[PDB]
Amino acid sequence: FMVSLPRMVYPQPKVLTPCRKDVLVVTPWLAPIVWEGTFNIDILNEQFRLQNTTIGLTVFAIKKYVAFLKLFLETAEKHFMVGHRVHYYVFTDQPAAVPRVTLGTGRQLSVLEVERRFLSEVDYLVCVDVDMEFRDHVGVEILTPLFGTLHPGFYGSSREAFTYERRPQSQAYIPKDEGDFYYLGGFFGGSVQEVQRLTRACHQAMMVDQANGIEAVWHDESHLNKYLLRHKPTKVLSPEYLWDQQLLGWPAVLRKLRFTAVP
Numbered sequence: 001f002m003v004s005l006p007r008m009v010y011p012q013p014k015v016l017t018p019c020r021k022d023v024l025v026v027t028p029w030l031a032p033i034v035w036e037g038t039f040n041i042d043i044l045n046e047q048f049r050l051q052n053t054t055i056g057l058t059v060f061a062i063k064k065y066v067a068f069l070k071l072f073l074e075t076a077e078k079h080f081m082v083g084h085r086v087h088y089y090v091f092t093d094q095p096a097a098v099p100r101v102t103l104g105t106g107r108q109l110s111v112l113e114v115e116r117r118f119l120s121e122v123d124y125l126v127c128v129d130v131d132m133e134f135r136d137h138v139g140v141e142i143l144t145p146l147f148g149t150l151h152p153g154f155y156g157s158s159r160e161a162f163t164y165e166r167r168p169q170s171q172a173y174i175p176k177d178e179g180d181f182y183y184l185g186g187f188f189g190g191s192v193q194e195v196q197r198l199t200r201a202c203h204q205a206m207m208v209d210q211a212n213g214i215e216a217v218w219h220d221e222s223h224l225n226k227y228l229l230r231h232k233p234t235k236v237l238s239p240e241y242l243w244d245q246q247l248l249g250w251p252a253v254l255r256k257l258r259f260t261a262v263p
């Protein structure tokens with residue numbers, strides 16, 4: 001049951017005025033593609049807060065990657081789901097090496113040394129790489145049953161150029177005439193149920209490949225792409241959500257650089 005929104009004053013949407021004229025804002029299966037200018041964050045914040053939404057953010061920090069945790073967490077505190085309940089899950093082989101980061105109210109962090117837990121603790125799961133930093137708003141506009149993020153190096157490429165696994169012997173195989181987009185393995189998510197279904201599917205597919213003596217060209221990312229090809233995401237995040245300014249600069253098409261690789 002969703003309670004009614006309160007009175008709100010904002011610009012009236014204009015039916016005869018495109019949101020963006022430079023980019024695709026909706027997929028062929030009617031899933032929005034999230035770009036700056038397509039959403040009113042005040043309306044979305046209201047909708048998700050009225051549901052007391054809790055977002056889980058998972059990251060793996062093994063070996064030398066634990067060094068990226070401080071900046072990652074500090075910047076997440078300034079830009080990730082601010083105003084909403086957030087539960088960070090840091091999977092690491094060095095529990096004592098996790099930095100003591102100060103968190104805002106309603107936000108918590110759990111250190112797990114290296115699934116029903118997620119089902120009872122959070123509503124949505126967001127899975128990202130740790131060698132990154134938030135530089136701008138990353139909020140509830142991304143929440144949906146299942147979402148993928150456009151790889152910054154292939155958003156303008158033809159499917160032929162996508163680095164999908166091209167060997168038929170692999171479970172991640174995708175032929176040259178198939179494919180919608182090339183999604184990043186480093187930023188995906190959705191409801192706990194959908195995220196677990198995806199990881200369960202990929203885990204099994206990778207086991208089959210291993211038994212068959214084959215490893216997908218881009219590992220988990222290759223399997224992720226096969227999954228999202230066969231199970232269309234309900235939202236697709238633009239490259240604003242995972243960019244590399246050092247290698248790609250700052251194109252006009254990107255009004256904001258929200259989550260980026262650390263040099």
Ligand SMILES: O=c1ccn([C@@H]2O[C@H](COP(=O)(O)OP(=O)(O)O)[C@@H](O)[C@H]2O)c(=O)[nH]1
Nearest residue numbers: 059060061062063065066128129130131186
């Ligand atoms: O502890 C880790 C290890 C890896 N990664 C992410 O997973 C990617 C691929 O890891 P892999 O070990 O397969 O290759 P490598 O990290 O040596 O380039 C890394 O680049 C990161 O983006 C991470 O976030 N935490």
Ligand SMILES: [Cl-]
Nearest residue numbers: 058127128129
């Ligand atoms: Cl991840």
Ligand SMILES: [Hg+2]
Nearest residue numbers: 019020037038
């Ligand atoms: Hg718009």
Ligand SMILES: [Hg+2]
Nearest residue numbers: 058125126127
């Ligand atoms: Hg995850």
Ligand SMILES: [Hg+2]
Nearest residue numbers: 058059127128
């Ligand atoms: Hg993860």
Ligand SMILES: [Hg+2]
Nearest residue numbers: 201202223227
């Ligand atoms: Hg998969």
Ligand SMILES: [Hg+2]
Nearest residue numbers: 202220223224
């Ligand atoms: Hg996957």
Ligand SMILES: [Mn+2]
Nearest residue numbers: 129130131186
């Ligand atoms: Mn990375």
